[PDB]
Ligand binder design. Structure first.
Ligand SMILES: [Mg+2]
Ligand SMILES: [Zn+2]
Ligand SMILES: [Zn+2]
Ligand SMILES: [Zn+2]
Ligand SMILES: [Zn+2]
Lengths: 391, 245, 97, 49, 115, 78, 178, 82, 189, 98, 124
C-alpha cells in the first residue's frame, strides 16, 4: 500500500506520516518537493501573509508548516472509518474498534490489588496526581487565560498518563524527569519478582519442612526418618470409613500431645472444626461418624517428597516412605547420596506431604526410589554402593 | 458508518420486519458474498434468506452480480436505504406538479418497487374507485394519459430487462439472468388500448409483458435542488428575481 | 509468607515444576501448586465473559448467566491488572462434559 | 499447552492426564420404554381435507 | 459468640505457629490464619503526613512558612529536644487559626513565636 | 478390533490406583476381603493384584476415536 | 446553539483565513474573558480546527502560533453524523412510546371496533354510552397526548430530512468521485 | 464532591417547529405510509408456528392467501418458494 | 390437562451407591430433584415417566462419584385453555372465588365470570348467588363445597428469579369461568 | 411450591478472548466516578472521602473496614472498579506503535 | 437440565392412576430412610394426586375397554381433545355435551348427541 500516494476513491493526495516528537505525530501533506511545486502546497503557503505581516519569524519557517496530529483529530478521524475496512487492518471487529484505541477514560483498580500501606501504593499517588492535574486544566481553561499554558499543561498530563502505565520511558527532558523510581504496571508483570516468574509458575507452598541431613545405614534405601517434632506439626486429613474407624478413635483419644494423635476434626454436615486441645472430653471419639475427617499426625508409612534445592535432573526430587524417629534431623541411607548429590557436611533438604489420595498414588508409583534405580540419560545405575561399603 | 447501520436496521424493521432486517444489516456489514456463507452466518432456514432476498431485489434494495467460478454475489448500497425518508417529499412535489392520479401512480410505483404500465394504471384506477361516488366512473384512458405525461417528463424511468435467450447463449441458462439496462427506451412507454371501469368493492394476457418501470430518484433530487436554489434566490433579492432565476 | 521470624513456607521453584513435568505426574503438581497454596473461587458471567460478584453481574444487571469457578488467586489477580491496563481477557466457558 | 494449564489450575494434558476413566457399573442402556395407551397414531387423523 | 454453642468464652490462642480464635467452651475453631506484611517490602517503606495526604500544607502563605521556619531555627539554636520543636510548631499552627493573629505585623508575630 | 498396546502403562496404573483409593476413602463397597489394613491405598493395591477393580479405561487416539479396555484384561506386570 | 456573538466570531474566522485571538477581540468587539472561552468551546467541539504553525521545528507549544482554520467539508461530515444519530434517537423514542402505550391502544381499538361493528345491522342504540362507561374515557385525553406527541415527533423527523437534503447535496457536489 | 446531575441545564433551546397545511399533509402521509407497510407480501413476518391442539375452530378462521411469486425471468433460478 | 415432556440432565451418583443397579439410582435421583416443582414454561412436574437412553458413566478427576447424562420423560401438569374441570372450593374473595384441585390451589373465578344476577354479598365474604324466578338471592358458595364444574380461560407464568446481588406467590396462576349453564354446583342441574 | 432452579452451575474454561474496552463499556463496568483529589477526611477519624479515591465502594484492604458495595469483609470481597474521566484525550503507550 | 419438547403428547387420567398405583406397590415396601425432605415432597404430591384421583369417574377402567371405546369413537370425527375430555369426565347428561363439543349445535344433531351419550354411559 505504501507505494501509492493518491486515494483512488476521491483522488485525494496524501503525504508521509512520521513521528515529529516524543509522543507527537505529524503528517506531511503540505510538504515542498524538489520536483514541480504542488498547487495545494502553494495555496497553503500563500495563505499565511496575515501572520507574516504580524510576526516576522513566520517567514523564515513558513516551510515547516505541516499537519500536526493531536488526540482530538485522530479520534475524530478514526471514528469515521467505514465498517467494511476494519478487518483488512487485521484488528478483529469483535475485539474492538480503532476509535476506542485512543483513550479518554480510565478505570481505577480495586483496593484489593493495592493494599493500604505501601503511605499508600504508588499507583494511588499516581492516580491522585492525574485527577489533580485534570482538575487544574478544567478550572484553568474556564478561567480563560492565554492559550500557551493550556496546551503545555496538557503535554505534561499526557506524559504523566503515559508514565502511569509504564515507568521506563527514557525520552523525558531534563527539567521534569522523575528523580525517583516507581512501580508502573509492566514493572509488576515483568521482572524475576513479577507475577509470571514469581507467583504463577513457581510459588510458595505449605505442609512442608526443612532441616539438616545426616546418615543412617539401617534404613532401607526407600525409607526416610523424620523427627518427632516435625511429625507433630504436619497432618493428613484422613476421611472416616468402615475400615479405619477404630484406628482413628485411638488417635483422637491421644489428643495433640502423645505422638500418634490428632489436631482437628471437621464434622460431616456443620463444617466448623473442633480443636482437639480444648475438647473437654474423649467423647468426640465416640461421636465419630462416617464422613468426618480427622487431621491426624504423620505416622509410619506415609508417602512424603524429598528435595535438594539446586535441582538439575529429575532424580533431584523423589518419594520416600516415612518412619518417625526421635532426633532433630532427617536421615537416609547413604547409597542414595549420588542422585541428590548430598554430602552431610552441613547440608539441608526440604520435605512436602501431599494432601490428596490421588497425589499419594502418583508419588509412590511414579516418583518412588524403587522405580528409579537408573538414570534416564543413558540407563546406567545411579543408586549403588558408595565409599566404605566398597572397601 | 455505525449510526448509518443503525438507521438501516431501524428502517428495515419498520418496513419489512425482523428477519429482513437481520439479513440486510448483516449483508451491509459484510459486503458482497455468496449465498451459502450468508445462510451459514445467519443460521436460519435458507428458505427465509431466499424469500427475503427475492423481496429485496424486487424493490431494488439489493443487487446480485455474476462472479468468477460461476458463483453469484449479492450486494447492497447504503445510499439506497436512505431514501424512503424522502418518499413523502416525492409524493408532495408530484401532487404539486400533477393531479391525484399522478400521485397514486407514483405511490403504487414506489410501494411495489417495479411494475409495468398496464398493471399500474389498472391498480391506480381500482384504488381510485373509492375517491368518487354517486355513479361516477373512470377509464384507463385518463390514467394512461397521466402516465405517459409523467414518463415524458422523466419522473418515470424504465427498469432493466433481460438479454434475449434465443439470441444470446443458447442452451442451459447461466446461474443468474444478468439483466441489462437500455437507455434509449428509458422514457419510451409501450402501447395499449384496453380500458376498464373499476369495481367499487362489491365483492361479486399482458400487452406490455416484461416492461417494468421505477421512479427516477435523480430527477427528484435535481428538482429538489432546483427548488432550494429558487428559494435561496427568492429570499436573496425578490420574488421577481426568483421568478427570473 | 517467606520469612523465618515470620512463619515460613518453602518454594516449588521453576526447577521443581519442571522435574514434575519430567515424571508426568499431572495431579501432583496440580495439588502442590494450587490446592495447597492459593485455591480460590470466583463468579464469571458467561454472557459478557468477564467476572462479577455474589452471583450478580453488574455489567449486565442480571443473574441468569453467572457461574462459579475455582481458579488460583494469583491468576485472578492477573485478570484484574490486565483489565485495568485496558487489555481485557474476556473468558469463554462451557460445560465440562 | 502445559504452561497455560498450570497457571489456570487445571490438570495438564500429558502423562496421567491423557485418557478418561469409566466405572464398570451394572447398568442397562436403552431399557424398555414404558408403553402409553391413549396416544397412538392409528386413533388420530386430521379433520382438514 | 460461638456459632456452635452460643456461649461467649472465645479465647485468642495459637498453636505452634498458627494464630486462631477458638471457642474454649467446646473446642471449636471460628477463625484462623492471618495476612501480614514482610521484611522484603519493609525496606521500601515510605511515609506521608496526613496533612499531605489530606490536602494541606499547600495553602501555607509565604509569611506563614517564613514564620514556622523562624520557629524551627529559634528553637533549634537553643538546643532543645525535637519534642520542643514539634510542640512549638503545633501550638503556632493552632494559634494561626485565629483571624486576629494571622492578620498582623511581623514583630508582633515574632514575639508570639517567642511566647 | 483393538490396535493399541496390550500392557498397562505406568501412567494408567498410577491414575487407576489413585482414583480407586479415593473411592475407598469414601464409603464405597470393597470388592475384596480385607485382613485389617486401614490405609486406602493398600486396599487398592490388593484389589489390583486380585484383578477386581471395577474401572474401565477409555484410550483416546489423537484423531478423535477411542478404545475401551478393561483393567482386568491388560497384562499387568512388575 | 451559541448566540449571535458566537456566529459573529465564527464567520469572522471564516472570512479571515488566518487570525489570532487578540485580533478577534479587537476586531470582534468581544470583551476579554468572553471570547477566549468561546473559541475554546468551538475548538473543543471540533467545529473549529486549529492549524498551529510553529516558531521552531520542534513544534513546541511555547514556540508556535495558534492560527485558526476552517475545513468546511469535514465540518459537514460531523453534522451528517449528528443528524444520523438524531433521527435514530427519535425513531427509538417513538417506538419506545408506542410499545409502552400499546396496552391502552389495543384496549381502545377493540372497543372502537365493537362500537363500529354491527352498526349497519340495525342493532339497538343501548351501547354507545354503556361501552363508554369504562376507564378508557378519562384516558382518551392521555391517548390524545400520545397521538400529538407522535405527530410532533414525526414533524421533527420531517424537518430534519429537509436539512439532510442540503447537507448531502453539498458533500456530493463537493466530491468528484474519481 | 457531588458530580453534576446527568442533565446539566442549557440556556439555548430548540427553535420552534414550522407548521402548515402542507406540513400537516406530510405528517398524515407519513402515517398512512407506515400503515401500508403492514398489508402486502413483502412484509415478511415469521411463519406461523406452535399450534396448541386440534381446535375445531381451525377449519374456519384459517388465513387463506395465494403464494407470492415474483416473475422468475428477472431472478436467478435458485430460490423457488415452491 | 396432563402433558408428557422430554428432558435431559447430568446426574451425580455418590460412591456409596455403587452397589444398587444404576438405572434405579438415576430414577430415584431425578424424582428427588424435580418432583413437586414448577418449570417456567411447562408448568408443575409430577414425576418421571420413563428413562429412554443412558450415556457412559465417567469419573472426573478429584472426585469419587460417577457422572452420567440421561434422556428421560416426565409427566407435567399443564392444562390448556377451555378445559372443563371439577374442583373443591378453597376460599371466597371480593375479586373472585378460590378453587382447589387438592394437589394444586391457584385457581381464581373472578366476578366477571360469575353469573350476571349475583354481584356482591351482604358484606359477608361467602359469595351468594341470585336468579330470576326461583332461588331468591339466597344460595351461597361454601369455602370448600363440592367439586364445582368450571372451565379455564386464562393462565400465566410469572418469574421469581433472584434479582440484584444476593444477601411468596406461586409462579403459576389460572383463571376459570362459571358463566355458562350446567356449571358450578351440581345441585343446580 | 416455588420455581425450580438448577443448583449446580459448575463449568470449565475453554478459551481466552483478548480485546479492548471503549469508553461506554469502561463506564458501564465501573460503579462510581472518582472526582475528588483528596485521600482522607479532615477530622481525626481519617475516614476516606465519599467520592475521592479509596472510597470503600471499591473494596477494602483493612481488617476492620468491610466493603460498602458488597457488605463483606476483606477475606471475601472480590473487589470492584471505579472510573476517572480525562478532560483532554491522550494516547496510550502500549498501542502508540499501532 | 434442558427441555427437548414441551407438547410431546397428552395423557389420560387412567394412565396417571396406573403410574401412581405401581409406584404405591413400590411404596412402603421397605423402611423409610429419612434421607431428606425430597421424600416428603414426592410422597405428598403423589398421595395428594392419589386421593384426588380416588374421587374421579375414570377409576376401575382398563387399557382394553378404553381402547375399544376409542375405536368405537373413531368414526364420529370428534377432535382428539374432545375425545380425551369425554374419556376423563364420563358425562351422564346432554347439557354438558352442549358445552364440551365445539359448535355442538352445528356439528352434531340431537340423535348423534344421544348416541354419544349412550355410548359413554354404557361402555364405561
Ligand atoms: Mg556438602
Ligand atoms: Zn478517497
Ligand atoms: Zn455479564
Ligand atoms: Zn463452642
Ligand atoms: Zn466489595
Amino acid at each position: 500500500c505504501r507505494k501509492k500516494n493518491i486515494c483512488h476513491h476521491c483522488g485525494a493526495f496524501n503525504g508521509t506520516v512520521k513521528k515529529c516528537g516524543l509522543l507527537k505525530i505529524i503528517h506531511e501533506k503540505y510538504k515542498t518537493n524538489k520536483k514541480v511545486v504542488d498547487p495545494i502546497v502553494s495555496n497553503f503557503l500563500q495563505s499565511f501573509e496575515t501572520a507574516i505581516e504580524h510576526n516576522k519569524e513566520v517567514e523564515p519557517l513558513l516551510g515547516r508548516a505541516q499537519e500536526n496530529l493531536n488526540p482530538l483529530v485522530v479520534l475524530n478521524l478514526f471514528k469515521r472509518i467505514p465498517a467494511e475496512d476494519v478487518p483488512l487492518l487485521l484488528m478483529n471487529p469483535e475485539a474492538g474498534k480503532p476509535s476506542d484505541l485512543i483513550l479518554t477514560r480510565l478505570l481505577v483498580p480495586p483496593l484489593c490489588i493495592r493494599p493500604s500501606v505501601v503511605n499508600e501504593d504508588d499507583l494511588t499517588m499516581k492516580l491522585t496526581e492525574i485527577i489533580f492535574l485534570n482538575d487544574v486544566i478544567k478550572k484553568h481553561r474556564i478561567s480563560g487565560a492565554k492559550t500557551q499554558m493550556i496546551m503545555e499543561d496538557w503535554d505534561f498530563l499526557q506524559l504523566q498518563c503515559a508514565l502511569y502505565i509504564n515507568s521506563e520511558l527514557s525520552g523525558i527532558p531534563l527539567n521534569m524527569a522523575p528523580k525517583k523510581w516507581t512501580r508502573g504496571f509492566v514493572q509488576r508483570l515483568k521482572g524475576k519478582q513479577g507475577r509470571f516468574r514469581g507467583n504463577l509458575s513457581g510459588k510458595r507452598v505449605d505442609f512442608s519442612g526443612r532441616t539438616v541431613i545426616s546418615p543412617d545405614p539401617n534404613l532401607r534405601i526407600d525409607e526416610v526418618a523424620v523427627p518427632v517434632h516435625v511429625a507433630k506439626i504436619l497432618t493428613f486429613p484422613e476421611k472416616v470409613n468402615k475400615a479405619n474407624i477404630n484406628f482413628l478413635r485411638k488417635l483422637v483419644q491421644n489428643g495433640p500431645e502423645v505422638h500418634p494423635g490428632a489436631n482437628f476434626i471437621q464434622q460431616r454436615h456443620t463444617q466448623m472444626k473442633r480443636f482437639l486441645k480444648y475438647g473437654n472430653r474423649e467423647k468426640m471419639a465416640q461421636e465419630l461418624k462416617y464422613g468426618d475427617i480427622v487431621e491426624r499426625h504423620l505416622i509410619d508409612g506415609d508417602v512424603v517428597l524429598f528435595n535438594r534445592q539446586p535441582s538439575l535432573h529429575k532424580l533431584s526430587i523423589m518419594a520416600h516412605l516415612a518412619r518417625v524417629k526421635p532426633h532433630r534431623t532427617f536421615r537416609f541411607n547413604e547409597c542414595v547420596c549420588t542422585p541428590y548429590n548430598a554430602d552431610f557436611d552441613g547440608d539441608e533438604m526440604n520435605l512436602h506431604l501431599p494432601q490428596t489420595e490421588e497425589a499419594k498414588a502418583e508419588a509412590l508409583v511414579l516418583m518412588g526410589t524403587k522405580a528409579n534405580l537408573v538414570t534416564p540419560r543413558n540407563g546406567e545405575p545411579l543408586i549403588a554402593a558408595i565409599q566404605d561399603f566398597l572397601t | 458508518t455505525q449510526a448509518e447501520i443503525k438507521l438501516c436496521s431501524l428502517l428495515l424493521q419498520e418496513h419489512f420486519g425482523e428477519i429482513v432486517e437481520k439479513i440486510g444489516v448483516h449483508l451491509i456489514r459484510t459486503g458482497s458474498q455468496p449465498l451459502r456463507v450468508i445462510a451459514h452466518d445467519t443460521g436460519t432456514s435458507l428458505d427465509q434468506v431466499k424469500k427475503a432476498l427475492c423481496v429485496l431485489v424486487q424493490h431494488n434494495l439489493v443487487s446480485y452480480q455474476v462472479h468468477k467460478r460461476g458463483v453469484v454475489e449479492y450486494e447492497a448500497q447504503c445510499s439506497r436505504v436512505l431514501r424512503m425518508l424522502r418518499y413523502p417529499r416525492y409524493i408532495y412535489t408530484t401532487k404539486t406538479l400533477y393531479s391525484d392520479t399522478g400521485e397514486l401512480i407514483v405511490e403504487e410505483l414506489l410501494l411495489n418497487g417495479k411494475l409495468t404500465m398496464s398493471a399500474v394504471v389498472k391498480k391506480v384506477a381500482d384504488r381510485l374507485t373509492e375517491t368518487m361516488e354517486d355513479g361516477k366512473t373512470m377509464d384507463y384512458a385518463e390514467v394512461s394519459n397521466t402516465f405517459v405525461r409523467l414518463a415524458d417528463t422523466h419522473f418515470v424511468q424504465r427498469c432493466p430487462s433481460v438479454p434475449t435467450t434465443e439470441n444470446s447463449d443458447p442452451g442451459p441458462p447461466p446461474p443468474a439472468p444478468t439483466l441489462v439496462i437500455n437507455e434509449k427506451d428509458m422514457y419510451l412507454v409501450p402501447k395499449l388500448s384496453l380500458i376498464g371501469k373499476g369495481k367499487r368493492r362489491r365483492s361479486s394476457p399482458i400487452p406490455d409483458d416484461g416492461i417494468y418501470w421505477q421512479a427516477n430518484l435523480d430527477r427528484f433530487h435535481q428538482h429538489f435542488r432546483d427548488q432550494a436554489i429558487v428559494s435561496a434566490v427568492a429570499n436573496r433579492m425578490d420574488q421577481t428575481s426568483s421568478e427570473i432565476v | 509468607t517467606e520469612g523465618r521470624s515470620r512463619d515460613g513456607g518453602l518454594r516449588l521453584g521453576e526447577m521443581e515444576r519442571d522435574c514434575l513435568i519430567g515424571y508426568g505426574a499431572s495431579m501432583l503438581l496440580l495439588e502442590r501448586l494450587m490446592i495447597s497454596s492459593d485455591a480460590f473461587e470466583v463468579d464469571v458471567c458467561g454472557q459478557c465473559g468477564l467476572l462479577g460478584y455474589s452471583g450478580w453481574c453488574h455489567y449486565c444487571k442480571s443473574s441468569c448467566h453467572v457461574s462459579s469457578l475455582r481458579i488460583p488467586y494469583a491468576c485472578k489477580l492477573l485478570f484484574q491488572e490486565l483489565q485495568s491496563m485496558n487489555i481485557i481477557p474476556r473468558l469463554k466457558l462451557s460445560k465440562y462434559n | 499447552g502445559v504452561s497455560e494449564c498450570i497457571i489456570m489450575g487445571i490438570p495438564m494434558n500429558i502423562g496421567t492426564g491423557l485418557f478418561k476413566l469409566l466405572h464398570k457399573a451394572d447398568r442397562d442402556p436403552n431399557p424398555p420404554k414404558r408403553p402409553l395407551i391413549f396416544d397412538t397414531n392409528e386413533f388420530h387423523i386430521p379433520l382438514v381435507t | 459468640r460461638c456459632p456452635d454453642c452460643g456461649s461467649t468464652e472465645l479465647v485468642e490462642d495459637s498453636h505452634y505457629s498458627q494464630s486462631q480464635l477458638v471457642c474454649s467452651d467446646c473446642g471449636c475453631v471460628v477463625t484462623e490464619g492471618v495476612l501480614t506484611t514482610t521484611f522484603s517490602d519493609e525496606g521500601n517503606l515510605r511515609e506521608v503526613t496526613y496533612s499531605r495526604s489530606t490536602g494541606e500544607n499547600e495553602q501555607v502563605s509565604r509569611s506563614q512558612q517564613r514564620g514556622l521556619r523562624r520557629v524551627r531555627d529559634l528553637c533549634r539554636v537553643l538546643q532543645l529536644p525535637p519534642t520542643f520543636e514539634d510542640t512549638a510548631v503545633a501550638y503556632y499552627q493552632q494559634a494561626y487559626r485565629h483571624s486576629g493573629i494571622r492578620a498582623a505585623r511581623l514583630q508582633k508575630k515574632e514575639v508570639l513565636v517567642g511566647c | 478390533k483393538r490396535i493399541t498396546t496390550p500392557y498397562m502403562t505406568k501412567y494408567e496404573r498410577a491414575r487407576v490406583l489413585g482414583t480407586r483409593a479415593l473411592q475407598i476413602a469414601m464409603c464405597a463397597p470393597v470388592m475384596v476381603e480385607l485382613e485389617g489394613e486401614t490405609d486406602p491405598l493398600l486396599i487398592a493395591m490388593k484389589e489390583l493384584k486380585a484383578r477386581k477393580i471395577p474401572i474401565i479405561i477409555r484410550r483416546y487416539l489423537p484423531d478423535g476415536s477411542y478404545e475401551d479396555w478393561g483393567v482386568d484384561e491388560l497384562i499387568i506386570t512388575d | 446553539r451559541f448566540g449571535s456573538r458566537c456566529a459573529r466570531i465564527f464567520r469572522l474566522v471564516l472570512q479571515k483565513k488566518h487570525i489570532e485571538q487578540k485580533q478577534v477581540e479587537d476586531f470582534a468587539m468581544i470583551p476579554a474573558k468572553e471570547a477566549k472561552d468561546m473559541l475554546y468551546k468551538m475548538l473543543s467541539e471540533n467545529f473549529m480546527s486549529l492549524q498551529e504553525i510553529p516558531k521552531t521545528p520542534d513544534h513546541a507549544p511555547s514556540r508556535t502560533f495558534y492560527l485558526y482554520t476552517v475545513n468546511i467539508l469535514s465540518a459537514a461530515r460531523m453534522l451528517l453524523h449528528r443528524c444520523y444519530k438524531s433521527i435514530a434517537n427519535l425513531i427509538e423514542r417513538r417506538q419506545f412510546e408506542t410499545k409502552e402505550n400499546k396496552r391502552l391502544l389495543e384496549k381502545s381499538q377493540r372497543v372502537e371496533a365493537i362500537i363500529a361493528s354491527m352498526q349497519a345491522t340495525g342493532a339497538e342504540e343501548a351501547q354507545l354510552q354503556e361501552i363508554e362507561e369504562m376507564i378508557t374515557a378519562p384516558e382518551r385525553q392521555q391517548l390524545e397526548t400520545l397521538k400529538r406527541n407522535v405527530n410532533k415527533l414525526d414533524a421533527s423527523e420531517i424537518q430534519v430530512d429537509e436539512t439532510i437534503f442540503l447537507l448531502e447535496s453539498y458533500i456530493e457536489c463537493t466530491m468528484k468521485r474519481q | 464532591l457531588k458530580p453534576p446531575p446527568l442533565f446539566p441545564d442549557t440556556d439555548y433551546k430548540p427553535v420552534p417547529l414550522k407548521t402548515g397545511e402542507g406540513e400537516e399533509y406530510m405528517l398524515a402521509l407519513k402515517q398512512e405510509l407506515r400503515e401500508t407497510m403492514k398489508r402486502m407480501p413483502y412484509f415478511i413476518e415469521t411463519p406461523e408456528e406452535r399450534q396448541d391442539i386440534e381446535r375445531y375452530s381451525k377449519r374456519y378462521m384459517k388465513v387463506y392467501k395465494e403464494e407470492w411469486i415474483p416473475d422468475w425471468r428477472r431472478l436467478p433460478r435458485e430460490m423457488m418458494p415452491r | 390437562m396432563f402433558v408428557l415432556v422430554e428432558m435431559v440432565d447430568t446426574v451425580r451418583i455418590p460412591p456409596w451407591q455403587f452397589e444398587r443397579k444404576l438405572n434405579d439410582s438415576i430414577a430415584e435421583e431425578l424424582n428427588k430433584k424435580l418432583a413437586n416443582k414448577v418449570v417456567y414454561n411447562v408448568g408443575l412436574c409430577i414425576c418421571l415417566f420413563d428413562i429412554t437412553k443412558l450415556e457412559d458413566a465417567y469419573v472426573f478427576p478429584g472426585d469419587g462419584a460417577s457422572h452420567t447424562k440421561v434422556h428421560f420423560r416426565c409427566v407435567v401438569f399443564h392444562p390448556f385453555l377451555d378445559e372443563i374441570l371439577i374442583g373443591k372450593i378453597k376460599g371466597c374473595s371480593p375479586e373472585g372465588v378460590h378453587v382447589s384441585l387438592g394437589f394444586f390451589d391457584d385457581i381464581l373465578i373472578p366476578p366477571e365470570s360469575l353469573q350476571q344476577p349475583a354481584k356482591f354479598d351482604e358484606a359477608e365474604q361467602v359469595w351468594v348467588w341470585e336468579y330470576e324466578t326461583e332461588e331468591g338471592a339466597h344460595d351461597l358458595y361454601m369455602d370448600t363445597g363440592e367439586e364445582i364444574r368450571f372451565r379455564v380461560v386464562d393462565e400465566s407464568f410469572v418469574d421469581t428469579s433472584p434479582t440484584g446481588p444476593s444477601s411468596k406467590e406461586a409462579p403459576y396462576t389460572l383463571v376459570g369461568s362459571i358463566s355458562e349453564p350446567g356449571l358450578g354446583l351440581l345441585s343446580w342441574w | 411450591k416455588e420455581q425450580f432452579r438448577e443448583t449446580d452451575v459448575a463449568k470449565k474454561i475453554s478459551h481466552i478472548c483478548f480485546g479492548m474496552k471503549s469508553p461506554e463499556e469502561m463506564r458501564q463496568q465501573a460503579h462510581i466516578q472518582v472526582v475528588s483529589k483528596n485521600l482522607y477526611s479532615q477530622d481525626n477519624q481519617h475516614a476516606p472521602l465519599l467520592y475521592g479515591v479509596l472510597d470503600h465502594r471499591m473494596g477494602t484492604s483493612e481488617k476492620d473496614r468491610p466493603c460498602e458495595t458488597c457488605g463483606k469483609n476483606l477475606a471475601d470481597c472480590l473487589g470492584h472498579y471505579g472510573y476517572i474521566d480525562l478532560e483532554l484525550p491522550c494516547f496510550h503507550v502500549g498501542y502508540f506503535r499501532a | 437440565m434442558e427441555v427437548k419438547d414441551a407438547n410431546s403428547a397428552l395423557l389420560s387420567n387412567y394412565e396417571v392412576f396406573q403410574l401412581l398405583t405401581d409406584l404405591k406397590e413400590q411404596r412402603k415396601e421397605s423402611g423409610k430412610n429419612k434421607h431428606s425432605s425430597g421424600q416428603q415432597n414426592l410422597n405428598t404430591i403423589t398421595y395428594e394426586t392419589l386421593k384426588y384421583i380416588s374421587k374421579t369417574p375414570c377409576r376401575h377402567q382398563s387399557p382394553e375397554i378404553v381402547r375399544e371405546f376409542l375405536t368405537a369413537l373413531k368414526s364420529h370425527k370428534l377432535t382428539k381433545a374432545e375425545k380425551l375430555q369425554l374419556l376423563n369426565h364420563r358425562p351422564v347428561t346432554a347439557v354438558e355435551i352442549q358445552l364440551m363439543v365445539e359448535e355442538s349445535e352445528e356439528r352434531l344433531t340431537e340423535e348423534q348427541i344421544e348416541a354419544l351419550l349412550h355410548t359413554v354411559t354404557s361402555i364405561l
